Design a protein around this ligand. Structure first.
Ligand code: ATP
Ligand code: ATP
Ligand code: PE0
Ligand code: PE0
Ligand code: CA
Ligand code: CA
Ligand code: MG
Ligand code: MG
Lengths: 590, 543
């Protein structure tokens, strides 16, 4: 109509699916699309995990330069933080929204038409008998007037991304039920829709789109039929119930899982893997316990009683940790008055940035696996300098971004996302030991972290880039740090980052030599024993963490910890999973 | 009569030994084992010790025992004909005591059973079975000797006759004339603190005789013991074999009360003189290789390891001067230093168990004669000189033994690496060695298994043995991984003291694995480091 172009200031809620077949580049492609959605469609306000899925039965330098020559949007990009989105709440509850521009169909008619598509598609795949999928859902607060307009823009975005490569579907658009059977749009109509949203500069693209939209189905035809879609939606909007559905997303999800089990004896989760991202690569949730080596610049420079920072010593230590098998380095410093009068002082920034810059330089000078760099800071300005100068990959925020929530804006650039660790604590090092009463220790901390993740996700931080840290020793008695470990299973769905290394609660476990503690100043014989015991105690927690599938463990003793993980991994590497009962029967037989 | 007939007879008896005293269970049951070896015949099978739910005079006792009239022969045996006969119900000679048939036995047993069920309306047991090749003529004579044994030791112990050959006997209203008891006893024992007043107690104590024991098939603890020793055995008076009766009793208890009767009934092994519950603690065995060197230095190292948390010390002088010269003096100095440090007498609890890593008869013999050790760690599983098995027993002492699997010697072993079914070849071998010692009278509960990591195994074979350590879930298990090459083989490449530290840490990983697999003992050089790991994992486990 003309209503499609009738420029009333609408605010709409759309749910999208983003999928690619390209394994090695799945992150780059999917995040590229995320940026294009954020630029051309509205605000990203929810995301699912990334998933590698198996079905029911390229030279990427193009992308990099594509990103520098993009047409401006006709809508303002706004990075401002939000703590709620009223239209999102309305969508979630089916609160009364404005009637659909496009004509709607009734439920029954909708169901029949979708079934027709599924049957027809099922049959074609039989004849066609002459691969991994990567999937991500997003909720978008959109300024686009209707799903046909949005699909038009989506189709434009897909074309921009071509030199399936990328597939962007619309799953929901408000509470609308729509099935438009025959769609041919003339080139000028596509132009005018595109022109309503983009400052169009270019004509090669339009042509390819003309035939590419045969029909429009909202909800997407496959919404309830493809497990991988249910799986993603279940991360984002588990309590959502659309009119066309028999139950909530969560109930539909659980029924699919349980019926796959009851009826086909298939565990559908086994072949559909949750992914998290540390830097720019896929990591499979719960498949690997990574080592994060600790670089505390204060300790490294000043614990011997010296007064100067030694950046070359610090960078050397970093190379040592890389050689010892750390996958990640966590660097931190604190503003410090190093005399007896504490007023002449060196800043956090001067502690860590020069070290990071010398590391970057020294790494570059050896092109003859770069470790992921994490920075343990709560300070906006420090993180901004690091990120602007490409010195770090991950924010490690021990306040869970409550010290300065604005730091969260630094985790998204135009063509980049950064991962973040959120830790639980109460207070600071001076007060925390007293801040120890919890109503329900395990669940208070979990609920705390979940609420922070909900806040970041609302602000367009991708769900799969957010890691949880329970903060061992930070406002927990020794027995409570243990109890948190005893109940580490409550994090089985989440990327988990823990730090037990050299903490007092380990010594609290002890009763009544090749030294693992490199002394900075001479300690008495009993303290050397205590340190050695503490480091071995933590190697015990490394083993536990291995068996509990903790994703990252943050340690001072990298060599020791890697030796433990290598042996446990080797003992787990079972060549034949049936051998043990097969060999058993054979011995009973012979 | 025909009761005291001069005929030299060889029978098979199956005994149950029971006590209520947890603190002294071992000393009491083993005292009884010794008295059974002395007064009844030869022990050729034993069960584990069990804890189930339904002292300074004893040492003195053993000094002034009256002598048996029968020989004690220690030569090793490979087989026992009469036992084979008993196991398969072959033909034996007629019972000199009158038998009853199945129906009558069952009837008379029911009567005892119900009459005892009545006597409820009107907590800890320690159990062990033994198979005895006996010179005693008949089960009634045997019961007389048994009652004597019980009086010598005295409530503190109950010794029942479970089986005696293939016989089915139910004699009621036994009255034994005071002079017959003396006469039966004198036929087996040179009768000369107790005079003849003991015989007075016994006269009332035999009221009837049931073979099989009335409760044989009715108490779980008896079935549990018998299943260890003779699972294929089927007496005429029984529905099926020991094993089936055992399995079908477990099955009843769970599908009729949701009990799972293994929660109350614990298999026990013994390292020295105390009860150890199988699979309930991972003990550390500290390694002292004397091959370090000087007595004083070596002995201070022993004290160092005790304080670091070792329950056991394993000393060896084998991987110029002799093995004997390396180890004996060290163990002598240890024993002296131990006894001096009785300034704190209260820590008589804190004496480490001592294990000697030898295959040399002469070395073990000197250790045992001088009370210098508790355990034989025989890396040949006692195949190098089986005569050493004779040293695992004294008149008032049993020693425990670790049996390890290897092939060849230190020069040849790396080449003897082919196995048809590695995990089960090694396990069956160990079971064969155990059967051999058990047949020779070594209590089953004192025998520990060791897979011999690194001895005739390639690195992947050592790992594979660890992966399948669950096959030892029923056995006391002792392993030594410490500082072995297979650990270093797991390390992913990416200087000497580097490899050394990786290896020590790689072993702490195996300590953790062993903790979770419930390995009973682990043999390590780095005692402090290992103890730290175990304390943490134990703390995590305690809710
Ligand atoms: N909600 C929707 N989102 C995206 N495409 C849709 C939707 N409803 C219908 N379509 C139609 O489906 C076709 C899109 O196919 P696409 O190229 O995305 O791969 P596909 O898997 O073959 O299709 P589909 O997205 O329907 O599964 C187009 O013709 C488009 O009009
Ligand atoms: N096979 C047997 N072994 C031991 N005692 C037996 C046997 N058959 C019958 N008895 C009789 O049972 C009594 C054994 O006394 P004991 O101290 O063992 O108490 P108990 O355990 O209650 O008896 P029982 O062992 O018969 O159940 C004696 O009177 C003994 O004659
Ligand atoms: N995220 C995180 N950071 C830390 N920084 C210092 C000490 N412990 C920790 C810790 O346990 N977790
Ligand atoms: N029982 C035993 N003894 C040993 N002696 C030396 C080296 N390894 C071992 C070992 O693994 N087990
Ligand atoms: Ca935007
Ligand atoms: Ca004997
Ligand atoms: Mg599609
Ligand atoms: Mg009795």
């Amino acid at each position: 109509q003309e209503l499609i172009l009738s420029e009333e200031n609408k605010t709409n809620i759309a749910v999208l699916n983003l999928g690619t077949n390209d394994r090695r580049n799945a992150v780059l492609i999917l995040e590229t699309a995320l940026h294009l959605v954020e630029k051309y469609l509205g605000k990203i306000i929810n995301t699912s995990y990334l998933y590698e899925t198996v079905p029911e039965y390229y030279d990427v330098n193009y992308i990099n330069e594509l990103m520098q020559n993009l047409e401006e949007s006709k809508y303002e990009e706004n990075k401002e933080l939000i703590d709620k989105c009223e239209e999102y709440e309305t969508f979630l509850k089916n609160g009364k929204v404005d009637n659909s521009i496009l004509k709607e169909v009734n439920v029954e008619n909708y169901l029949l038409e979708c079934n027709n598509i599924i049957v027809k598609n099922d049959e074609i795949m039989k004849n066609n008998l002459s691969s991994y999928f990567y999937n991500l859902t997003v909720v978008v607060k959109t300024f686009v007037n209707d799903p046909l307009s949005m699909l038009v823009v989506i189709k434009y975005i897909e074309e921009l991304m071509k030199r399936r490569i990328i597939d962007i579907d619309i799953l929901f658009f408000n509470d609308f039920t729509i099935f438009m059977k025959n769609i041919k749009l003339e080139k000028n109509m596509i132009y005018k829709i595109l022109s309503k949203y983009i400052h169009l500069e270019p004509q090669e693209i339009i042509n390819n789109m003309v035939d590419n939209i045969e029909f429009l189905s909202i909800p997407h035809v496959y919404t309830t039929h493809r497990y991988s879609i249910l799986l993603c939606l279940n991360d984002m909007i588990p309590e959502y119930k659309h009119n066309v559905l028999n139950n909530t997303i969560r109930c539909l999800y659980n029924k699919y899982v349980s019926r796959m089990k009851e009826q086909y004896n298939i565990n559908i989760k086994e072949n559909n893997k949750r992914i998290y991202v540390l830097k720019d690569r896929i990591s499979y949730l719960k498949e690997k316990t990574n080592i994060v080596g600790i670089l505390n610049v204060n300790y490294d420079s000043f614990s011997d009683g010296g007064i100067f920072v030694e950046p070359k010593r610090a960078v050397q230590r970093m190379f040592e940790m890389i050689n010892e098998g750390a996958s990640v380095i966590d660097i931190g410093g604190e503003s410090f008055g190093p005399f007896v009068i504490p007023n002449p002082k060196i800043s956090e920034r001067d502690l860590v940035v020069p070290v990071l810059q010398l590391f970057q330089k020294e790494w570059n000078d050896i092109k003859n696996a770069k470790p992921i760099i994490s920075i343990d800071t709560i300070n906006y300005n420090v993180f901004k300098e690091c990120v602007d100068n490409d010195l770090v990959d991950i924010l490690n925020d021990i306040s869970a971004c409550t010290n300065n929530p604005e730091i969260i804006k630094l985790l998204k650039k135009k063509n980049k996302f950064y991962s973040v660790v959120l830790m639980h604590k109460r207070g600071n090092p001076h007060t925390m030991d007293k801040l120890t009463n919890y109503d329900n220790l395990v669940y208070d901390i979990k609920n705390y972290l979940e609420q922070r993740l909900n806040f970041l996700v609302l602000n367009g931080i991708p769900r799969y880039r957010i890691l949880f840290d329970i903060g061992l020793g930070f406002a927990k008695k020794h027995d409570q740090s243990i109890k948190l470990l005893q109940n580490i299973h409550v994090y089985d769905e989440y990327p988990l980052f823990i730090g037990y290394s050299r903490k007092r609660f380990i010594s609290h476990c002890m009763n009544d030599h090749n030294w693992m503690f490199q002394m900075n100043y001479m300690r008495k014989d009993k303290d050397q024993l205590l340190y050695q015991k503490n480091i071995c105690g933590g190697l015990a927690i490394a083993s536990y963490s291995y068996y509990k599938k903790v994703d990252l463990i943050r340690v001072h003793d990298v060599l020791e910890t890697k030796s433990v993980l290598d042996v446990l991994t080797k003992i787990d590497q079972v060549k034949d999973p049936n051998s043990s009962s097969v060999d058993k029967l054979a011995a009973a037989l012979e």
